Design a protein around this ligand. Structure first.
Ligand code: HEM
Ligand code: HEM
Ligand SMILES: CCCCCCCC/C=C\CCCCCCCC(=O)OC[C@H](O)CO
Ligand SMILES: CCCCCCCC/C=C\CCCCCCCC(=O)OC[C@H](O)CO
Ligand SMILES: CCCCCCCC/C=C\CCCCCCCC(=O)OC[C@H](O)CO
Ligand SMILES: CCCCCCCC/C=C\CCCCCCCC(=O)OC[C@H](O)CO
Ligand SMILES: CCCCCCCC/C=C\CCCCCCCC(=O)OC[C@H](O)CO
Lengths: 157, 157
């Protein structure tokens, strides 16, 4: 099996939905004024991470989507993407930090489930999802700290 | 083909993400004061529609996820789901009616592509998506009318 451009571009187009949430809800002064941990990355790190992940996750899905028995893996993939799209509107749109922690935690679970199901069909597709699970872990940690350091403000859920 | 509860519940859980956007962004007085066409349904119709569609689309995806060549169909399904999740944050969260029309139009394309790809593998999966395409058409019309009848308000954007 090889590069299937129809599949890859379909999965890449699907990443247009979360990318659109980030483009329309760029962090503002509210984000700057939030209490954040010292290990909170600078602003320019986040566009680099998600652009890379969108390409990595669509490559991996393209490989898996060509294999028999793909059904459960691709259902997991649909779930993680939808909750990925949900996160930025919850955190930066509605300003509900605690609810957003629930969202990223569910997303984390489905990312892990997708990665595992990918490993059962295609090892490289699973490997391609390893930096996504690492980054999703990191995002979960940053959501928790932001929520914790601003617990006494109404933005907590 | 089979009744596969693991697959069905995975697709149903995936619809929790768009359902969460609806739960968190209930239409308010801003929606009430918008100019609407006469065929704009009452508020109680929309929860009925979307609950039904979540189950129909998950049953249909469950059938497709059990066949060979499902990959392109499920990639279309993933794409459609993510833009479904994106719509309500754009229209009711950010209040960008014109931008939301672009989102529902892309979602419409992927609904149609999913339904057609579903018909190539399983007729029942395709038929189950016919009420989804109809409702998405209807939703597109309501977005268009809302934007057009309120063109001179800043939310038309
Ligand atoms: C699952 C969790 C998350 C998702 C899906 C997500 C998604 C995104 C997306 C799509 C972008 C746009 C990147 C681009 O323009 O190419 C972005 C940027 C950004 N996000 Fe995240 N994000 C998540 C977690 C977080 C967290 C926890 C924080 C802060 C505590 C955060 C802060 C930012 C910032 C500061 C930027 C870029 C701001 C700038 O470019 O000036 N994100 N994110
Ligand atoms: C792709 C397009 C759309 C999606 C994905 C979507 C999604 C949803 C969801 C998930 C709910 C929650 C239903 C529930 O609570 O069970 C909802 C309710 C609702 N939506 Fe939509 N919607 C769309 C288009 C529209 C449009 C175009 C309008 C109006 C012009 C609209 C108006 C409403 C109203 C009035 C409610 C319920 C309000 C209430 O229960 O009091 N929706 N929608
Ligand atoms: C039966 C097989 C044939 C049918 C299969 C359909 C094949 C093409 C589907 C979608 C491509 C259109 C989407 C535009 C191209 C994707 C790359 C892109 O530009 O969007 C990525 C996104 O912007 C990143 O953030
Ligand atoms: C076959 C069906 C084709 C469906 C049409 C696909 C075109 C839109 C896809 C991605 C663009 C979404 C926004 C692109 C990224 C903007 C945010 C940065
Ligand atoms: C051809 C079938 C697969 C053959 C085995 C390939 C997968 C190798 C496993 C992990 C990469 C090492 C970890 C990634 C680098 C750190
Ligand atoms: C594919 C291997 C056999 C399947 C066994 C494990 C895979 C599915 C497990 C749980 C369903 C997903 C979680 C249930 C739906 C969330 C609510
Ligand atoms: C292998 C197992 C993978 C893990 C899978 C199980 C994890 C939970 C999944 C989704 C959250 C459940 C649904 C999220 C809430 C949706 C319902 C809802 O919010 O409806 C609002 C009304 O009110």
């Amino acid at each position: 099996m090889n590069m299937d451009w129809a599949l890859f571009l379909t999965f890449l187009a699907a990443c247009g939905a979360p990318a659109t949430t980030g483009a329309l809800l760029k962090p503002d002064e509210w984000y700057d004024n939030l209490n954040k941990p010292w290990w909170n990355p600078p602003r320019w790190v986040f566009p680099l991470a998600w652009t890379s992940l969108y390409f990595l996750m669509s490559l991996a899905a393209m490989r898996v989507a060509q294999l028999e028995g793909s059904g459960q893996a691709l259902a997991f993939y649909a779930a993680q993407l939808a909750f990925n799209t949900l996160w930025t509107p919850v955190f930066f749109g509605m300003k509900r930090m605690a609810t957003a922690l629930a969202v990223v935690m569910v997303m984390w679970l489905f990312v892990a489930a997708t990665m595992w199901a990918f490993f059962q069909l295609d090892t490289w597709a699973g490997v391609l999802f390893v930096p996504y699970l690492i980054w999703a872990t990191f995002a979960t940690g940053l959501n928790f700290e932001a929520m914790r350091l601003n617990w006494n403000r109404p933005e907590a859920r």
